[PDB]
Design a protein around this ligand. Structure first.
Ligand SMILES: [Zn+2]
Ligand SMILES: [Zn+2]
Lengths: 310, 146, 310, 146, 310
């Protein structure tokens, strides 16, 4: 069967350059030639114990666009985990007896890994576990970055914002230290700077990374400007010092930007990317969000079908 | 001068100040076996060592390796009817499960009924620990808490 | 048409040994041979004005696994019963004009019977009305009990826990006083003991029932140990004396249990069934929850199709 | 001798699975001197006993009055230059300060900066203990619940 | 020099048969002939960290009728203990650098004893600490019993209500055990019963008590019937079965009562003494309330004056 059939997708740290590449190739196919019945007769749980617009609705629209049924919850207030007091472990145990795959969003890091101990033979796809991982975010980023820059190796990538609680940037910095000669510039506050553990993995593979205090310092050199939102709900009250985007970007700044360059952002965007940037050639965040459709249906297909689609 | 032992396990060469910390950490005392412990002993090799003899008891492969986290210079003497049948020695284990608690408040491991586990890693001065679940690495010192 | 086509399912007190038996036979069939299009072109309301994991998601997964559409709500906060102030009676009246069957969960006993006065020709299936009935719970219990013990007649059944607000045990004690020579041991606190009305129905059919203060007293004799959760939300503040499971069960106790014996629990389980019991041969609650799929699709099929499936 | 010391203390007839709590409580590892612990040794009348040997170190008042409430069986031995200068058993005190924690949730002892104190009646049944602050008296067992 | 001069009046246990009788003798005297400037130039702290109408307003009026000055609070809400977070130990420390004696009410048991360890030289008089001691209550009750029965030896005293959490009944069973030949009758919900510690002591002194389910079973034998309130605010959740008054006195029950018999109640009373009892020659709880002025005047006089001649 194919490299990822029945495989749970929890962290980017568990996939190779090769599984990533499969997923993008299959998205490339699937965008060109739809597969309406590919999962006809499958039912998938969409379980968000956290909030979502993008990940919930792109995953439930992708399942729908391959013939599958969706059952689930957008909120935990009315589950019995929500009012009768059950453990995650039993939610997952009973939901395993019903649906063929589980997509789950959760506020505690490790919820998805915990869910695989109990999902039985059912795959658990991680829609984001607190501030740890967001593996399917990374897949539509890689898709979008290659779609735009032509490659995924030898890119100057700046990651601006909350790198501490940025589940998006944890997974993306790990996915891109798999391809070669990629360059990182990390522009955060100190409080909310990139995790140490990440940088270790970076030193060990000899990847060139560097901290910076200005978009202006990186503007000319960069290819992908990846912008984040301060993870407001995830901050410590000691950290409330920086709830407003230190770095905020306007179209002015794009003055000295490389013609190829693309501004990527996971969204929501609150104050950090000014609406004037929306008219530029560089703005690519609404494009990156639609690429959530194909990367996300590429995925489902690979985990619930043995036969790699074409 | 401590005791004569018929058969079991004698972890000798525990650094003085760690023998009590070990008998507590890994539930060694929760037994009905005769244990005899020499806290603070003249070694020469180390100025002072500690030493535990657990009669009619043996440690597993992984059991012994867990000790290297606190005691790589320990020597675990396997003894069968007065013969030093074995002289076992802890390498780093690849994972210590069920004895530690993640420094991360918002990890799933606290709230849910699952054993803990950490990938052990020799970093560059001390030993780094990565939680299975939240996946954050912590200094081993930190892991042993406040 | 078959015995239950267009029939509302509100209380176990309105069905015979015969309707129960039909439902289990049809589940037995349906588990062996799926019927993907059986309800292709049907739309069913899933209306929970209460909380749920199991009943909502097993009923919406069963409908999906027979080709039907589901419309509805998991919460009443955003309906117009929820914010514009409407009566149940008009929710039900307008929802009858749209969907072919209504599954409804509600916090007041009698909500479902009230809904049949207004659902028109549409069947109303009771997902649980306060602490009165839970008829489809009983059906996956009967399925599971027969699946395990081989029979549904001449069983020693102990029901441990909150027997006062246990909508599950109201319906199950009524379903099993239809088959013969079944034996009951009721282990509750006094405050939360089995309803009088139930015991009457039991005296009249000469069923052997008996109260007990220990699992240990029943252990050897019993076949099905049916465990309940204290209905925390349904208690009187005078009753808050016993919010913790008086009887809590650990694997130790299974020491003197009959080889055949199965531990059944409707779930959620909070403190009452210890996680060590999960490793035993006797633990059968995650199995009983998956049997919610087939009993629940057996049902839908019978109420919305004339032709009894095969 | 079944182990030996010049000056020091040897405590004996310690109940099983009490010696290790005692090592914990009286901080007996905050010490640089030789220690011998005989975990779960025997005692003809009462099967197994733990035994602790603090070399050239003696216990203060507090600790022995604690030792009474934790071990009315033990006998504490003052050994100077190997002679058992004295071998004395504990008698309960009047009052225990600063180690017991009052069972009363609403006891002021909790919230405010005060060393606890408990009054000790010897109930024919057991040991009744009274809080200095809330004036509730408890079973010694209610209190000593570790 | 007088015996209670400078004393802390915390627990009835600390006060003796003669300290008690010295107050009452004093009381009768300031009641016979008043002392309007006895305490002229003394300033006193009224510290009520818990609600009061009677204990605070009686104590305060007493202070004024002796010429003393009051400073204080009615709630910690406003203090810097309750807003800036200082400890009670620090609070009692600065307040003792200001006044001549401290009167305090306080929700935790034992606050009173804690205050003394920090008041230095200033006498601390306990207005009630949670469910423990209420010694100024007792003094006024002893005063009121004396006036009506003419004796504090050989009575038949019935205590009815919440005996567990009632500090009034705690203090009162301890002062009356100091007199000769007093018969006790406890009538409580057993979950709200007299602490065994008091009972032990009553037994240690060979005094006779007895539990009863009725009040009609003892009306005939009593001199004093002391009613109490269920301490809602102190009750634990397990005890919410116990909020409404069990035993409730009505004017009809007094029917076979000794003509001398008085109904005493600390007050406030909720539903336990029907107001029809107020129109009887047995009702006396309002008289008793008035007598709180004379016993609190007495006690202040004695602690703050070194010799009294009156
Ligand atoms: Zn963790
Ligand atoms: Zn206390």
């Amino acid at each position: 069967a194919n490299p990822l059939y029945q495989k749970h997708i929890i962290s980017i740290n568990d996939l190779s350059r090769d599984d990533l590449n499969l997923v993008l190739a299959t998205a490339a196919k699937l965008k060109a030639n739809p597969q309406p019945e590919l999962l006809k007769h499958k039912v998938i749980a969409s379980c968000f114990f956290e909030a979502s617009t993008r990940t919930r609705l792109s995953f439930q629209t992708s399942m729908h666009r391959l013939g599958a049924s969706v059952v689930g919850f957008s909120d935990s207030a009315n589950t019995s985990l929500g009012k009768k007091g059950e453990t995650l472990a039993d939610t997952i145990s009973v939901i395993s007896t019903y649906v063929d795959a589980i997509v789950m969003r959760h506020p505690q890091e490790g919820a998805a890994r915990l869910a695989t101990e109990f999902s039985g033979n059912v795959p658990v796809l991680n829609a984001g576990d607190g501030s740890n991982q967001h593996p399917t975010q990374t897949l539509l980023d890689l898709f979008t970055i290659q779609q735009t820059e032509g490659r995924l190796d030898n890119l100057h990538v700046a990651m601006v914002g909350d790198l501490k609680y940025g589940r998006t940037v944890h997974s993306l910095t790990q996915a891109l230290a798999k391809f070669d000669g990629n360059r990182f510039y990390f522009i955060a506050p100190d409080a909310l700077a990139m995790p140490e553990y990440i940088l270790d993995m970076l030193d060990e593979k000899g990847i060139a990374w560097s901290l910076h205090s200005s978009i202006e310092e990186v503007m000319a050199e960069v290819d992908i400007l990846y912008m984040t939102r301060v993870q407001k709900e995830r901050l410590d009250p000691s950290e409330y010092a920086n709830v407003k985007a230190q770095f905020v970007l306007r179209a002015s700044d794009l003055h000295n930007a490389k013609a190829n360059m693309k501004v990527l952002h996971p969204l929501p965007r609150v104050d950090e990317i000014a609406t004037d940037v929306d008219k530029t050639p560089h703005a690519w965040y609404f494009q990156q969000a639609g690429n959530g459709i194909f990367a996300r249906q590429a995925l489902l297909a690979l985990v619930l079908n043995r036969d790699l689609v074409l | 001068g401590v005791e004569a032992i018929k058969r079991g396990t004698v972890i000798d060469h525990i650094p003085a100040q760690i023998g009590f910390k070990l008998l507590s950490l890994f539930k060694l005392t929760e037994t009905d076996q005769r244990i005899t412990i020499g806290l603070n002993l003249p070694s020469g090799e180390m100025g002072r060592k500690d030493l535990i003899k657990i009669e009619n008891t043996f440690l597993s492969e992984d059991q012994v390796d867990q000790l290297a986290l606190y005691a790589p210079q320990a020597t675990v003497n396997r003894i069968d009817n007065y013969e030093v049948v074995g002289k076992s020695r802890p390498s780093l284990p690849e994972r210590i499960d069920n004895v530690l608690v993640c420094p991360n408040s918002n990890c799933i491991s606290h709230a849910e009924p699952v054993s803990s586990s950490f990938a052990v890693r020799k970093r560059a001065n001390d030993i780094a620990l990565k939680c299975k679940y939240c996946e954050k690495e912590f200094s081993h010192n930190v892991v042993l808490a406040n």
